[PDB]
Design a protein around this motif. Structure first.
Motif, short mmCIF file in Angstrom:
data_model
loop_
_atom_site.label_atom_id
_atom_site.label_comp_id
_atom_site.label_asym_id
_atom_site.label_seq_id
_atom_site.Cartn_x
_atom_site.Cartn_y
_atom_site.Cartn_z
N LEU A 1 47.23 -17.03 62.88
CA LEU A 1 47.13 -17.10 61.42
C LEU A 1 48.46 -17.54 60.81
O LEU A 1 49.53 -17.26 61.36
CB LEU A 1 46.77 -15.72 60.85
CG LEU A 1 45.51 -15.11 61.45
CD1 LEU A 1 45.27 -13.69 60.92
CD2 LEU A 1 44.35 -15.98 61.14
N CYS A 2 48.39 -18.23 59.66
CA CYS A 2 49.59 -18.53 58.88
C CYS A 2 49.97 -17.33 58.03
O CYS A 2 49.24 -16.33 57.96
CB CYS A 2 49.36 -19.75 58.00
SG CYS A 2 48.36 -19.44 56.54
N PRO A 3 51.09 -17.42 57.31
CA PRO A 3 51.47 -16.29 56.44
C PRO A 3 50.42 -15.91 55.43
O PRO A 3 50.36 -14.72 55.06
CB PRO A 3 52.76 -16.76 55.76
CG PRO A 3 53.34 -17.75 56.73
CD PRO A 3 52.13 -18.47 57.31
N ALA A 4 49.61 -16.86 54.98
CA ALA A 4 48.59 -16.68 53.95
C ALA A 4 47.26 -16.22 54.53
O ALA A 4 46.30 -16.02 53.77
CB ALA A 4 48.37 -17.97 53.18
N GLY A 5 47.17 -16.04 55.84
CA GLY A 5 45.96 -15.54 56.45
C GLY A 5 44.94 -16.60 56.79
O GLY A 5 43.78 -16.25 57.07
N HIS A 6 45.32 -17.88 56.77
CA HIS A 6 44.42 -18.95 57.20
C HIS A 6 44.46 -19.08 58.72
O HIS A 6 45.42 -18.70 59.39
CB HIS A 6 44.79 -20.32 56.60
CG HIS A 6 45.05 -20.32 55.13
ND1 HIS A 6 46.13 -20.98 54.58
CD2 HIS A 6 44.34 -19.82 54.08
CE1 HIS A 6 46.12 -20.82 53.27
NE2 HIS A 6 45.05 -20.11 52.94
N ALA A 7 43.40 -19.68 59.27
CA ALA A 7 43.37 -19.96 60.70
C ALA A 7 44.16 -21.23 61.04
O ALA A 7 43.86 -22.31 60.52
CB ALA A 7 41.92 -20.14 61.16
N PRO B 1 40.41 -22.81 57.33
CA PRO B 1 41.39 -23.61 58.09
C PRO B 1 42.66 -23.79 57.27
O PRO B 1 42.64 -24.13 56.09
CB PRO B 1 40.65 -24.95 58.33
CG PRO B 1 39.24 -24.60 58.24
CD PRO B 1 39.12 -23.53 57.21
N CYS B 2 43.78 -23.57 57.93
CA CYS B 2 45.07 -23.70 57.28
C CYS B 2 45.41 -25.15 56.98
O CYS B 2 45.27 -26.02 57.84
CB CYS B 2 46.14 -23.13 58.19
SG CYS B 2 47.77 -23.07 57.45
N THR B 3 45.92 -25.39 55.77
CA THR B 3 46.52 -26.67 55.44
C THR B 3 47.96 -26.49 54.99
O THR B 3 48.52 -27.39 54.34
CB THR B 3 45.71 -27.39 54.36
OG1 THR B 3 45.73 -26.58 53.18
CG2 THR B 3 44.29 -27.59 54.83
N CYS B 4 48.59 -25.36 55.34
CA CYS B 4 49.92 -25.04 54.82
C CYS B 4 51.02 -25.84 55.51
O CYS B 4 52.10 -26.01 54.93
CB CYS B 4 50.27 -23.54 55.00
SG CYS B 4 49.21 -22.41 54.04
N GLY B 5 50.82 -26.20 56.77
CA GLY B 5 51.86 -26.87 57.54
C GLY B 5 53.02 -25.97 57.86
O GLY B 5 54.15 -26.45 58.00
#
Ligand SMILES: COc1ccc2nc(C)c(O[C@@H]3C[C@H]4C(=O)N[C@]5(C(=O)NS(=O)(=O)C6(C)CC6)C[C@H]5/C=C\CCCCC[C@H](NC(=O)O[C@H](C)C(F)(F)F)C(=O)N4C3)nc2c1
Ligand SMILES: [Zn+2]
Length: 198
Positions: free
Chosen positions: A163-169, A115-119
């Protein structure tokens, strides 16, 4: 009559979106006849790999995505159906019609997205044709296609990931927002809504 009442078959994994390398591509792992038999028995002995599965019922085909050990998809594709597995039908562990969301335990051999936490608002939608479509996040559950295209190109990709840039969902693709047949935006189930359901 009760003696004649039929049972709906299981959702069956029929392929995957390979994201392992430099090039994204769809792979089929089961053809239509084998899919039909596997849906009736619920017994799928095929090896599962990867994060994004291509799934099918007798009447529909769509995607399912593993995030944090759960294979997630849309209720409008799966309903309340079991999924086929090596040991037989597996009952849903999550069902939320209000979110158009279902989930089963992730299959042995699958890889789960984190799971993405990048925001971040610079997202990528992965389709059943292994198109990687840039999407600008526009709200909790909405994003706009940077390059609009006919809804035909998105049909069958519900259940796929943003997906985010980092490949997270970041979310699960749910619906297309269209004007005169052209998809300008997408509606998706955010991963926090999944993480809440969990
Ligand atoms: C039954 O219990 C349910 C509970 C909750 C629920 N909740 C939603 C939002 C829902 O929406 C249905 C199904 C999706 C869809 O078709 N999903 C994609 C897809 O690919 N499905 S699929 O894989 O082919 C399939 C059908 C095999 C599974 C991703 C679409 C691809 C192309 C669009 C095609 C024309 C359709 C344009 C629609 N737009 C839209 O409603 O937009 C509005 C404004 C919204 F607010 F939702 F954004 C749209 O997208 N719908 C319409 N049904 C339900 C049903
Ligand atoms: Zn991220």
């Amino acid at each position: 009559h009760m003696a004649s009442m039929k049972k709906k078959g299981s959702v069956v994994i029929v392929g995957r979106i390979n994201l392992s390398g430099d090039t994204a591509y769809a792979q089929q792992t089961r053809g239509e006849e084998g899919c039909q038999e596997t849906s009736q028995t619920g017994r799928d002995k095929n090896q599962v790999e990867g994060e994004v599965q291509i799934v099918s019922t007798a009447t529909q085909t769509f995607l399912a995505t593993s995030i944090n050990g759960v294979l997630w998809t849309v209720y409008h594709g799966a309903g309340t159906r079991t999924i086929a597995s090596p040991k037989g039908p597996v009952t849903q562990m999550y069902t939320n019609v209000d979110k158009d969301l279902v989930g089963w335990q992730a299959p042995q051999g699958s890889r789960s997205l984190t799971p993405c936490t990048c925001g971040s608002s610079d997202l990528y939608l992965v389709t059943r044709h292994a198109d990687v479509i840039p999407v600008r996040r526009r709200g909790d559950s909405r994003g706009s296609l940077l390059s609009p295209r006919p809804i035909s190109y998105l049909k069958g990709s519900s259940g796929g990931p943003l997906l985010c840039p980092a490949g997270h969902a970041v979310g699960i693709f749910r619906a297309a927002v269209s004007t005169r047949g052209v998809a300008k935006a997408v509606d998706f189930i955010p991963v926090e809504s999944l993480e809440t359901t969990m």
